[PDB]
C-alpha cells in the first residue's frame, strides 16, 4: 500500500519539525508546499484552532488516543477538498506543538498515524481521482 506509506512519511515529517522547530522526489515537493500552505492556514485560523485545543483538553497519552473519535466525526461531516485536508494536517501540527510544551513529545508519532489513518480510510478514492500527492503540489502551485 504505497499511498498509505507515502502519506504517513509526509504527515509524520511535518508534524515532527513543527514541534522541534528544526527542518530535515514527489515527497520532497509535497513537504515544501505543506510548509508554505500549512503555516499560512495556522495563522489565518488561530482563533478557531486555540478554541478547539482548549475544548479538547489534551494533557496525556489517553487523550491523544481518544482524538480519533472527534477526528472522524468532524472531518466526515460535509464535502471534502484540498483546503480541508490541509486544515486537518495544519491543526495536527498545532496540537503537536502543544504536546511539546506539556512534555508529551512521545505522542507526536501516534497522532501522525491516526491522522494518516483517517485521511486514507475515508478519502482514498477522492485522493486517487485527484492524482494523490502529485495533485496536491499542482493544486497549490504559485
Amino acid at each position: 500500500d504505497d499511498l498509505y506509506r507515502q502519506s504517513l512519511e509526509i504527515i509524520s515529517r511535518y508534524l515532527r519539525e513543527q514541534a522541534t522547530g528544526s527542518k530535515d522526489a514527489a515527497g520532497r515537493r509535497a513537504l515544501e508546499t505543506l510548509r508554505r500552505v500549512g503555516d499560512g492556514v495556522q495563522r489565518n485560523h488561530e482563533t478557531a484552532f486555540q478554541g478547539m485545543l482548549r475544548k479538547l483538553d489534551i494533557k496525556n497519552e489517553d487523550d491523544v488516543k481518544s482524538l480519533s473519535r472527534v477526528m472522524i466525526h468532524v472531518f466526515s461531516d460535509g464535502v471534502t477538498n484540498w483546503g480541508r485536508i490541509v486544515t486537518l494536517i495544519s491543526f495536527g501540527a498545532f496540537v503537536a506543538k502543544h504536546l511539546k510544551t506539556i512534555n508529551q513529545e512521545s505522542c507526536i508519532e501516534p497522532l501522525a498515524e491516526s491522522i494518516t489513518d483517517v485521511l486514507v480510510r475515508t478519502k482514498r478514492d477522492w485522493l486517487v481521482k485527484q492524482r494523490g500527492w502529485d495533485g496536491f503540489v499542482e493544486f497549490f502551485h504559485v
Epitope: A25, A26, R29, K129, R131, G132, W133, D134, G135, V137, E138, F139, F140, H141
Partner: single-chain antibody, 229 residues
C-alpha cells in the same frame, strides 16, 4: 513569454515508429501536468495522453493504448510522445498543452507538428450562425461520469491557428477573454453564450471535461460558428 514548442513530425510508413518532443519555456515545468491532443486534417480535437508532475499518474485514450508511450524530463523542460506500430488513422497535427493544477483547464498550447502515416463522448450541434449584435448559444451534452461529476472547459480555434482557452470551470473567463463570452452548467449539459456577435467570433468552438469511468478526457465534436450580414 510562457511558451510550448513541438518537434518530431514527419512522413512515416504504416507500422513505422516516430518520436515527438515538446520544449517548455517561461515557467516552473516540474510543477504542472502535461497533455498531448491531436487533430486529423479537417477534423475535430482528440485527447491522446497525460502525465502528472512526478510521472506517477499516466492516462491514455483507448485508440492509442499499447502503441503510444508518454514520458517527461523535468531537467530538460521536455515532454515526449513515443509512437510505435503507427496506423493510417494516426495522421494528425499533435499539440502540446499545459494543465492548471486548481482547474484542469489547458491554458497554454503549442503551434503543433504534422505526423503523416502513409463518435466523441460529448455532443455539440455541428453549426451555429448569427448577425452582428445578436446573442447566440452553443450546447454541450454529456453524462453522469463526465459533465455530471466534473467541470466543463471551452476552447476557441480561429482559422489556421492552434486552440486557446476561452472558458474554464463552467463559467470562468481567463485574462484577455472579453465579457461577451459566458458559460453555464446544469445537470449533465453545458452551454456557451456570445452576448453580442462580432466578426472576429467566426471560429470553431469545442467543449471538454474529464470522465471518471473512462479515466480519460472527452472533447466535444465541435461547432463551426458563422457571422452573417
Amino acid at each position: 513569454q510562457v511558451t510550448l514548442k513541438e518537434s518530431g513530425g514527419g512522413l512515416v510508413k504504416p507500422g513505422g515508429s516516430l518520436r515527438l518532443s515538446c520544449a517548455a519555456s517561461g515557467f516552473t515545468f516540474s510543477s504542472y501536468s502535461m497533455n498531448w491532443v491531436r487533430q486529423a486534417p479537417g477534423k475535430g480535437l482528440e485527447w491522446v495522453s497525460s502525465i502528472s508532475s512526478s510521472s506517477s499518474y499516466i492516462y491514455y485514450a483507448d485508440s492509442v493504448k499499447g502503441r503510444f508511450t508518454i514520458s517527461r524530463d523535468n531537467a530538460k523542460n521536455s515532454l515526449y510522445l513515443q509512437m510505435n506500430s503507427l496506423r493510417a488513422e494516426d495522421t494528425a497535427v499533435y499539440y502540446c498543452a499545459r494543465q492548471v493544477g486548481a482547474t484542469w483547464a489547458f491554458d497554454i498550447w503549442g503551434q503543433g507538428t504534422l505526423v503523416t502515416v502513409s463518435q466523441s463522448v460529448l455532443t455539440q450541434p455541428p453549426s451555429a450562425s448569427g448577425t452582428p449584435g445578436q446573442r447566440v448559444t452553443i450546447s454541450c451534452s454529456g453524462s453522469s461520469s463526465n459533465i455530471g461529476s466534473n467541470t466543463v472547459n471551452w476552447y476557441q480555434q480561429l482559422p489556421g491557428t492552434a486552440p486557446k482557452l476561452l472558458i474554464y470551470s463552467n463559467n470562468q473567463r481567463p485574462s484577455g477573454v472579453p465579457d461577451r463570452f459566458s458559460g453555464s452548467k446544469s445537470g449533465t449539459s453545458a452551454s456557451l453564450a456570445i452576448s453580442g456577435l462580432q466578426s472576429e467570433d467566426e471560429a470553431d468552438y469545442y467543449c471538454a471535461a474529464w470522465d471518471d469511468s473512462l479515466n480519460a478526457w472527452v472533447f466535444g465534436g465541435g461547432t463551426k460558428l458563422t457571422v452573417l450580414g
